[PDB]
Ligand binder design. Structure first.
Ligand code: 402
Ligand code: SF4
Ligand code: SF4
Ligand code: SF4
Ligand code: SF4
Ligand code: FES
Ligand SMILES: [Mg+2]
Ligand SMILES: [Mg+2]
Length: 579
């Protein structure tokens, strides 16, 4: 094919869109509703308008190049059309960036600036409460910001195949929302937040826990523990202009101390606890020749997916609490026992790359003797805002260490945040446990990486077992619906709702679509975690020194007795009932 773009001739056999071809050849075309190789098929945004000679104005993002095409991306007519489209979006947009939570990295603001667009009549809503939905424990909607670009609907479809985010006709006007405009929690929604990650503006956000945290910090009698997820240390630096793939663990510890938290622990300690219990459970299932398979239970969006779509699997879920909840349970029991704190005065905060962790922490039964396992969960983004609001110079902070008693972690815990990390971590301990050995070969590269469904054969005590790693909620559906679960007997299956694992969770820093094409965000964030594992002295969860002391002095033997009494949680399908 011979293509001419802005007077430049190209000769190509590529079969692709104008947008993709132009961008591959360093020709600027704007886009808004195009993302994840999809645009908004109904009511296209047309920000990607170009002019094709003999045809007129076309959308570059969904028009294939054809031989003989003569294209102009920057004519007066093209720019007036794009400016008009942005102007019409401003007409439905509460354009007040000052207090907006996307002020620093908004895609729409960049387009408004680029085209110098202005509303025909400013959109100034008197009563915002009609536009805002904060009922969810995890998600919130601010429709005064919504561009009806469809990126959340497309992302939910692709990431989960639930189509829990939908277009709705609300009193004659188009909105996005959950089925029948219900609270997301009351629908089949997984609360994974991939819709937030896809949103170009501040229309979708996490349910704020910021006030819970500040009120607890300011309460004289509260002793506030903070502990961050594996993924936070591989990601939060993005929001401080430090680039991608930067390990900022020590700076986080320092910032949390400067924020006034009273104890600095780490959820990777809870990850090692989860492995203690789950690898022990796997060995008991092996020794009892069932029940198989056992599924991980640490991703609360996967738990919701099982509850909503596969309730017959709930009995197969590991009973070990997630790293967050298992840490939290220990923070109200073991921690007072080594500190003198009144358990009622301990307030446990986690920092997560995840929105469904808020739903998990707020599950009614996730408590004991009136004490919540976890009192507040803030996302990576929320912690970034806290640090900036306190004027803490994050990129310049010196490194500090965590408090050790619930803060040490092994390399197995460190890799939890990548798809296959829980699998690899659990196998390192289950094989030692079952063979009564301290084995040297601990790297299970077969379960790593971005393939959507991964499987491997492992040898445990001179028998062979089959494991699988499901990498993304849509791939859970593919694995089940395609019958893949029945090609062989699976014994242990890891499921994460977010493709790439928690490093790509719904509470993570937004990345604009341009950077997403230069940077493999899922692999670059996960690289921080595998690097920590490679350089840590202890690379198995049962070699964590602070954890071994806690089990010896307080919990006893994992998987039974006291440990099973309080560190476990079982989900039950609803009993049969009609209708
Ligand atoms: N609880 C828990 Fe996890 C741990 O450890 C996180 O904190 Fe994850 C991350 N990063 C998140 O969110 S949840 C799913 N298992 C893998 S990692
Ligand atoms: S969503 Fe973007 S354009 Fe709209 S108010 Fe917030 S920062 Fe400004
Ligand atoms: S939270 Fe996940 S499942 Fe729910 S609407 Fe958003 S993308 Fe879909
Ligand atoms: S919520 Fe965000 S992604 Fe969804 S349609 Fe509105 S602006 Fe687009
Ligand atoms: S994969 Fe991690 S970040 Fe994503 S929903 Fe599950 S627990 Fe949350
Ligand atoms: S970016 Fe092409 S129609 Fe929206
Ligand atoms: Mg399309
Ligand atoms: Mg305080």
């Amino acid at each position: 094919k011979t293509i001419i773009i802005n007077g430049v001739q190209f000769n190509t056999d590529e079969d692709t869109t104008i947008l993709k071809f132009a961008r591959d050849n360093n020709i600027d075309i704007s886009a808004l509703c195009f993302l994840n190789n999809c645009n908004n098929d109904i009511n296209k945004c047309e920000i990607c308008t170009v002019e094709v000679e003999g045809t007129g104005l076309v959308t570059a993002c969904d028009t294939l190049i054809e031989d003989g095409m003569i294209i102009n991306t920057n004519s007066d007519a093209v720019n007036e059309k794009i400016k008009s489209r942005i102007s019409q979006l401003l007409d439905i947009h509460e354009f007040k960036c000052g207090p907006c939570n996307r002020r620093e990295n908004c895609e729409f603001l960049k387009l408004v600036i680029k085209y110098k667009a202005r509303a025909s009549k400013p959109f100034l809503p008197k009563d915002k409460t009609e536009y805002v939905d904060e009922r969810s424990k995890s998600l919130t909607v601010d429709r005064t910001k919504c561009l009806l670009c469809g990126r959340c609907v497309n992302a939910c479809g692709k990431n989960t195949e639930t189509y829990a985010m939908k277009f709705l006709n609300k009193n004659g006007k188009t909105i996005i929302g959950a089925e029948d405009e219900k609270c997301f929690d009351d629908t089949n929604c997984l609360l994974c937040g991939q819709c937030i990650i896809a949103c170009p503006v501040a229309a979708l956000s996490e349910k704020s826990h910021m006030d819970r945290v500040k009120n607890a910090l300011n309460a004289p009698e509260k002793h506030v523990i903070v502990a961050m997820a594996p993924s936070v240390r591989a990601s939060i630096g993005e929001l401080f202009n430090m680039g991608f793939g930067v390990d900022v663990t020590g700076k986080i510890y320092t910032a949390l101390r400067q924020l006034g938290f009273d104890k600095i622990f780490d959820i990777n300690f809870g990850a090692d606890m989860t492995i203690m219990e789950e690898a022990t459970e796997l060995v008991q299932r092996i020794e009892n020749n069932g029940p198989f398979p056992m599924f991980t239970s640490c991703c609360p969006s996967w738990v919701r997916q099982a509850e909503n779509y596969y309730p017959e699997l709930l009995n197969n879920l590991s009973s070990a609490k997630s790293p967050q909840q298992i840490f939290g349970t220990a923070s109200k029991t073991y921690y007072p026992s080594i500190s003198g704190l009144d358990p009622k005065n301990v307030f446990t905060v986690t920092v997560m790359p995840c929105t469904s962790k808020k739903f998990e922490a707020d599950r009614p039964q996730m408590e004991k003797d009136g004490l919540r396992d976890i009192d507040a969960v803030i996302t990576t983004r929320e912690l970034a805002k806290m640090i900036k609001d306190a004027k803490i110079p994050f990129a310049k902070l010196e490194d500090s260490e965590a408090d050790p008693a619930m803060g040490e972690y092994s390399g197995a815990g460190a890799i939890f945040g990548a798809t296959g990390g829980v699998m690899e971590a659990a196998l390192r301990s289950a094989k030692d446990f079952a063979e009564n050995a301290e084995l040297e070969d601990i790297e299970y590269k077969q379960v790593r990486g971005l393939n959507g469904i991964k499987e491997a054969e492992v040898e445990i005590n001179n028998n062979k077992y089959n494991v699988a790693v499901i990498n993304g909620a849509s791939n859970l559906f593919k694995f089940m619906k395609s019958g893949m679960i029945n090609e062989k007997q699976y014994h242990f299956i890891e499921v994460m709702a977010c493709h790439g694992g928690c490093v790509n969770g719904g509470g993570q820093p937004h990345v604009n679509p341009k950077d997403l094409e230069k940077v493999d965000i899922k692999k670059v964030r996960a690289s921080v975690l595998y690097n920590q594992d490679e350089h840590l002295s202890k690379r198995k969860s049962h070699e964590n020194t602070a954890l071994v002391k806690m089990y010896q002095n307080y919990f006893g033997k994992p998987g039974e007795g006291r440990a099973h009494e309080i560190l476990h949680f079982k989900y039950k399908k609803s009993a049969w009932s009609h209708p």
